[PDB]
A paper describes a structure:
Promyelocytic leukemia protein (PML), belonging to the TRIM family, serves as a valuable model in this field. Within the nucleus, this 70 kDa PML protein molecule has the capability to assemble into a super protein complex, known as PML nuclear bodies (NBs). PML NBs participate in various important cellular pathways, including DNA damage repair, transcriptional regulation, self-renewal of stem cells, regulation of p53 stability, cell proliferation, apoptosis, and defense against viral infections. The RING and B-box domains are zinc-binding domains.
In this study, we report the cryo-EM structure of the PML46–256 dimer, which encompasses the entire RING-B1-B2 domains and a segment of the CC domain. After multiple rounds of 2D and 3D classification to eliminate heterogeneous and incomplete components, we determined the cryo-EM structure of PML46–256 at an overall resolution of 5.3 Å, with the core region slightly better resolved (~4.4 Å). In our cryo-EM model, each PML monomer comprises helices α1–α7 and beta strands β1–β7. Unlike other TRIMs, the RING, B1 and B2 subdomains are folded together, centered around the PML α3 helix, resulting in a PML monomer. The RING, B1, and B2 domains are arranged surrounding the α3 helix and are distributed on the outer surface of the PML molecule. In this inner α3 helix, residues F108, F109, L112, and L116 form a hydrophobic core, intermittently mediating the engagement of the PML RING, B1 and B2, respectively. The current cryo-EM structure revealed that the PML monomer, which serves as the basic unit for assembling PML NBs, forms a functional PML dimer via two α6 helices. Specifically, V123, F177, and L178 within the α6 helix from one monomer interact with their counterparts from the other monomer, facilitating this dimerization. Additionally, two SUMOylation sites, K65 and K160, are located on the outer surface of the dimeric PML46–256, giving ample space for PML SUMOylation. Despite the prediction that the CC domain would be a long helix, the density of the C-terminal CC residues 236–256 were not visible in this PML dimer. Furthermore, based on the current model, the C-terminal S221 residues from the two monomers locate on opposite sides of the PML dimer, facing away from the dimeric interface. This suggests that the two PML CC helices following S221 might be positioned on opposite sides of the PML dimer, resembling the arms of an octopus.
Residue numbers in the entry:
A (entry chain A), B (entry chain B): 46 to 190, 201 to 221
The structure:
């Protein structure tokens, strides 16, 4: 399994992320990428350590999709698509062209902001970089209501400067 | 000519750059990308408006290769390779794997800093994004003596914060 090694690089749990440690975050402190996953980013409930189940490997909660959006921010600035890593990731059935979201409402929000960051099927198959460059230059949009952040719920080029910690 | 349109996007003159205007620069003010090309970035000589010839379309001067390095910074953070745009760009004969430099000494410097940002032939042919992601995560190096800047002549993740204007 060639592309299977892409996540074995970190033994990721049904997710994909190239950076083992973000140099900055909207949360309190920079730590191992799994630290904010081991315990919810902003969830004060006893479910924050996901004793009942984690959302990123399988949809569990809307607030725990904050982790999904956190990973999706990095995948938006530069996309380490899990589909190329794992074409079986299409089991979600690809409701929309943007990755690292679920329940169709984060997708609908990316649409509301006309800020899809769509990874087309041609991009999912990893055969081109022209569309990648297009999406990259589009990372800085000129419309609103640059890339989404749930805390403020608005496009922000890098909410790391905000330190939202919603 | 499919890939020929990539530079016709801006009618570029024997060069490649996706951003028609950098949102920030090490120079004085943000302007059209051609403004700093019409007149040298830091050259006070009467040759700054390249009446004798421009360096970016064809090697003319070492100080005018500051433009080459400026474009190469953007192409390093995200690479709009002219080779995919124009496979004839290999006429340089590909002395080394990094693009947007000449005279082999900027290349030797990228090597000195163990900071090649090499675009392998597999990447030149535009068939993969895994090596791109590798080089991207390597954009932030852990060695020195992150990406080169001639003014200080040292790796800088974004010399825009420095406003070098050497």
């Amino acid at each position: 399994p060639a592309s299977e090694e892409e996540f074995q690089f970190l033994r990721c749990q049904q997710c994909q992320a190239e950076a083992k440690c973000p140099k900055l975050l909207p949360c309190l402190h920079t730590l191992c990428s799994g630290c904010l996953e081991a315990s919810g980013m902003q969830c004060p409930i006893c479910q924050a350590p996901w004793p009942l189940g984690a959302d990123t490997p399988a949809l569990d909660n809307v607030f725990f999709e904050s982790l999904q959006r956190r990973l999706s921010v990095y995948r938006q600035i530069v996309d380490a698509q899990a589909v190329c890593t794992r074409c079986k990731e299409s089991a979600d059935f690809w409701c929309f062209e943007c990755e690292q979201l679920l329940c169709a409402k984060c997708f609908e929000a990316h649409q509301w902001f006309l800020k899809h960051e769509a990874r087309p099927l041609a991009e999912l198959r990893n055969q081109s970089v022209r569309e990648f460059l297009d999406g990259t230059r589009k990372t800085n949009n000129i419309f609103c209501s640059s890339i989404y952040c749930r805390g403020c719920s608005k496009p922000l080029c890098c909410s790391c400067a905000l330190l939202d910690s919603s």
